[PDB]
Write an enzyme that holds these catalytic residues in place. Structure first.
Site, PDB file in Angstrom:
ATOM      1  NE  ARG A  37     -22.624 -53.016   6.735  1.00  0.00           N
ATOM      2  CZ  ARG A  37     -23.506 -53.421   5.288  1.00  0.00           C
ATOM      3  NH1 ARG A  37     -24.638 -53.794   5.645  1.00  0.00           N
ATOM      4  NH2 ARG A  37     -22.966 -53.278   4.276  1.00  0.00           N
ATOM      5  CG  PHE A  40     -31.531 -48.910  13.280  1.00  0.00           C
ATOM      6  CD1 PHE A  40     -30.422 -48.229  14.266  1.00  0.00           C
ATOM      7  CD2 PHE A  40     -31.342 -48.239  11.963  1.00  0.00           C
ATOM      8  CE1 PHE A  40     -29.390 -47.447  13.871  1.00  0.00           C
ATOM      9  CE2 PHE A  40     -30.131 -47.425  11.489  1.00  0.00           C
ATOM     10  CZ  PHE A  40     -29.266 -47.318  12.536  1.00  0.00           C
ATOM     11  CB  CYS A  42     -28.223 -49.959   6.231  1.00  0.00           C
ATOM     12  SG  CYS A  42     -27.539 -51.664   6.343  1.00  0.00           S
ATOM     13  CG  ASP A 155     -25.621 -43.031  24.547  1.00  0.00           C
ATOM     14  OD1 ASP A 155     -24.821 -43.131  25.638  1.00  0.00           O
ATOM     15  OD2 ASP A 155     -25.843 -43.586  23.746  1.00  0.00           O
ATOM     16  CG  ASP A 173     -30.003 -40.741  21.327  1.00  0.00           C
ATOM     17  OD1 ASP A 173     -28.628 -41.380  21.467  1.00  0.00           O
ATOM     18  OD2 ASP A 173     -30.862 -40.827  22.210  1.00  0.00           O
TER      19      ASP A 173
HETATM   20  C1  LIG Z   1     -18.482 -38.193   7.584  1.00  0.00           C
HETATM   21  N1  LIG Z   1     -19.729 -38.536   7.873  1.00  0.00           N
HETATM   22  C2  LIG Z   1     -20.938 -38.130   8.034  1.00  0.00           C
HETATM   23  C3  LIG Z   1     -21.738 -38.898   8.723  1.00  0.00           C
HETATM   24  C4  LIG Z   1     -23.340 -38.892   9.168  1.00  0.00           C
HETATM   25  C5  LIG Z   1     -24.004 -39.691   9.891  1.00  0.00           C
HETATM   26  C6  LIG Z   1     -25.092 -39.487   9.858  1.00  0.00           C
HETATM   27  O1  LIG Z   1     -25.869 -40.457  10.836  1.00  0.00           O
HETATM   28  C7  LIG Z   1     -26.774 -40.307  11.695  1.00  0.00           C
HETATM   29  C8  LIG Z   1     -26.669 -39.531  12.703  1.00  0.00           C
HETATM   30  C9  LIG Z   1     -27.418 -39.216  13.649  1.00  0.00           C
HETATM   31  F1  LIG Z   1     -27.277 -38.339  14.778  1.00  0.00           F
HETATM   32  C10 LIG Z   1     -28.665 -40.037  13.622  1.00  0.00           C
HETATM   33  N2  LIG Z   1     -29.539 -39.837  14.871  1.00  0.00           N
HETATM   34  C11 LIG Z   1     -30.682 -40.501  14.823  1.00  0.00           C
HETATM   35  O2  LIG Z   1     -30.981 -41.436  14.246  1.00  0.00           O
HETATM   36  C12 LIG Z   1     -31.719 -39.867  16.087  1.00  0.00           C
HETATM   37  C13 LIG Z   1     -31.169 -38.747  16.808  1.00  0.00           C
HETATM   38  O3  LIG Z   1     -30.425 -37.848  16.350  1.00  0.00           O
HETATM   39  N3  LIG Z   1     -31.875 -38.565  17.737  1.00  0.00           N
HETATM   40  C14 LIG Z   1     -31.873 -37.134  18.721  1.00  0.00           C
HETATM   41  C15 LIG Z   1     -31.044 -35.959  17.889  1.00  0.00           C
HETATM   42  C16 LIG Z   1     -30.571 -34.833  18.669  1.00  0.00           C
HETATM   43  C17 LIG Z   1     -31.209 -34.734  19.906  1.00  0.00           C
HETATM   44  F2  LIG Z   1     -30.850 -33.598  20.636  1.00  0.00           F
HETATM   45  C18 LIG Z   1     -31.879 -35.941  20.714  1.00  0.00           C
HETATM   46  C19 LIG Z   1     -32.130 -36.901  19.776  1.00  0.00           C
HETATM   47  C20 LIG Z   1     -33.098 -40.046  15.993  1.00  0.00           C
HETATM   48  C21 LIG Z   1     -32.098 -41.188  16.722  1.00  0.00           C
HETATM   49  C22 LIG Z   1     -28.957 -41.034  12.806  1.00  0.00           C
HETATM   50  C23 LIG Z   1     -27.881 -41.143  11.840  1.00  0.00           C
HETATM   51  F3  LIG Z   1     -28.133 -42.025  10.913  1.00  0.00           F
HETATM   52  C24 LIG Z   1     -25.900 -38.570   9.732  1.00  0.00           C
HETATM   53  C25 LIG Z   1     -25.061 -37.281   9.124  1.00  0.00           C
HETATM   54  N4  LIG Z   1     -23.745 -37.503   8.908  1.00  0.00           N
HETATM   55  C26 LIG Z   1     -20.966 -39.780   9.320  1.00  0.00           C
HETATM   56  N5  LIG Z   1     -19.704 -39.625   8.870  1.00  0.00           N
END
Ligand SMILES: Cn1cc(-c2cc(Oc3cc(F)c(NC(=O)C4(C(=O)Nc5ccc(F)cc5)CC4)cc3F)ccn2)cn1
Ligand SMILES: Cn1cc(-c2cc(Oc3cc(F)c(NC(=O)C4(C(=O)Nc5ccc(F)cc5)CC4)cc3F)ccn2)cn1
Lengths: 297, 297
Positions: A37, A40, A42, A155, A173
């Protein structure tokens, strides 16, 4: 219940989103299985359907409690930024769902082993020193790539690197974190105001709030330290308000127990008070590669 | 190719420079776009980056052909002198670049309309008499401020006042000039020896080479004359070698065509042969304010 005026979004943004749109009968969102959570909304487990019919395990990031159109815009641009990167150590995008009714979605590949920080803290896994140096090297490679696209991260830390089924580190990110015994991820930064992770920030970022690739290099140094201490918090016995002075005095994170001398020397070069004297990510890849190559374990 | 021993500079000077330092990550010097050439070096157009992201148009003053450490020192102190003034009619400093390898830089805000002398000479602009009195008043205010900080200017003249996009006059110590058709600024004073702008100098400065606030007041008088004649050269039919005698005889610049009587009276009071009988800048601000206030045009 959300109704979004698509006409109130920048039209180029909408067109970019169209190049990575998700099919109408391809995504299943498992609302029963929450990953985290944030402010933004979930993040859910989800199941995306391949262009063939194949079932892909993904993470669905959903925008909820929307108050203005600017929030939709930012959510969507964050998604688009990560569509135009392509590198094995940078987290990629599977797609976006943008409809006039309902929560907008950003879909990401599922990362079997979650964030890198919880992985190295986990006592069931016994990652060796060599492995940890390996992880730091994969991160350098991801940042090297991003720095070549003139992208400044802002970050970088172990909590924002994901780890996949092949133990490939994806720089990301994510903005979320979790504790050893917590089932779910939560927000790291405040709802409003600048994102300021003080203990990962370069001296000049602490003073001027200006972030550059050279300040990402500092954060990387700290990220290396996390790796070599298996996820210890940095400067634990230092208050976030005194960090700046502590750094100005010339003090730095100390050498972790089993960290090699020349890797600690890399960390110090990352923490040089003058930004232009710090190494580029390209130099870091070469230095750490050499170290990894001659390391026995 | 220049390498400077920073340890050979006064340490307080280096510390002061640190309070206004620019990152080599933020400044772009457009070597292709020269503003002027002096004996110290070149002045370029440049682009500085705001503490987070904004592009600021600036003028980069570079020290070239350095022969000794004293030259670096003076260049840097000139920069620091202008950091500790803060007034809308005094030219401010954006920053300084001081590194061991390369030319030291002083960065200044770009002044859309250049020097005040070329502006009032320019026939595309039709500044009215009231405007010109306005410019003289803004100059008095700048000098009033500088005289309150016990700062003696030494080289006040229209060529050393800049003019910004809002038509604010910034008093400055530029040291450079240019002609109506020249694309580029050049040095006014000789490479070596004292800076002696004879036709702007007080009688006692001509004789004793001592400059005081009261001699700045004289130069101001002459500066006012330049304004009211739209940049005519003073004492055109007089040789720089005979100026002293000419003044000793009691002769003075004559009343310009559309100059008001009480403003010409101010100019004469500025040229009183006894320094202590001349008005202070504070008195000049009041007198010229009153005149400006009751002027119709
Ligand atoms: C077992 N397990 C699996 C998980 C698990 C959890 C996950 O959740 C997320 C991971 C993210 F990285 C983002 N990232 C993002 O939303 C963004 C992002 O990644 N930006 C960005 C990326 C790369 C760059 F170089 C620069 C900017 C758009 C912001 C979101 C998510 F929901 C996803 C997959 N797997 C968690 N635990
Ligand atoms: C269109 N256009 C814009 C341009 C244009 C040209 C510019 O060049 C310069 C102007 C200066 F005034 C100095 N000044 C100086 O270097 C110093 C100075 O100003 N000292 C000082 C200042 C104020 C005081 F009260 C007392 C001392 C340190 C001597 C330097 C410059 F490169 C800058 C901006 N704009 C020229 N044309």
């Amino acid at each position: 219940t959300v109704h979004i005026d698509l006409s109130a979004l920048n039209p180029e943004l909408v067109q970019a989103v169209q190049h990575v749109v998700i099919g109408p009968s391809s995504l299943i969102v498992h609302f029963n299985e929450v990953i985290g959570r944030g402010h933004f909304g979930c993040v859910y487990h989800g199941t995306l359907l391949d262009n063939d019919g194949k079932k892909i395990h993904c993470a669905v990031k959903s925008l909820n409690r929307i108050t203005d159109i600017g929030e939709v815009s930012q959510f969507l641009t964050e998604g688009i930024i990560m569509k135009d990167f392509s590198h094995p150590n940078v987290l990629s995008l599977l797609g976006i769902c943008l409809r006039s009714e309902g929560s907008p979605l950003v879909v990401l590949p599922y990362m079997k082993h979650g964030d890198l920080r919880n992985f190295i803290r986990n006592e069931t896994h016994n990652p060796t020193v060599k492995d940890l140096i390996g992880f730091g090297l994969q991160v350098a490679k991801g940042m090297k790539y991003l720095a070549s696209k003139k992208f400044v991260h802002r970050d970088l830390a172990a909590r924002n690197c994901m780890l996949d089924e092949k133990f490939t580190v994806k720089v990301a990110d994510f903005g979320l974190a979790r504790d050893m015994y917590d089932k779910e991820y939560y927000s790291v930064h405040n709802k409003t105001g600048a994102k300021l992770p003080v203990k990962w920030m370069a001296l000049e970022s602490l003073q001027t709030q200006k972030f550059t690739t050279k300040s990402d290099v500092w954060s990387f140094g700290v990220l290396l330290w996390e790796l070599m201490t298996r996820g210890a918090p940095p400067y634990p016995d230092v208050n976030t308000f005194d960090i700046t002075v502590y750094l100005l005095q010339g003090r730095r994170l100390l050498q972790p127990e089993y960290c090699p001398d020349p890797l600690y020397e890399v960390m110090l070069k990352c923490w040089h008070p003058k930004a232009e004297m710090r190494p580029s990510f390209s130099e870091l890849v070469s230095r750490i590669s050499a170290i990894f190559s001659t390391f026995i374990g």
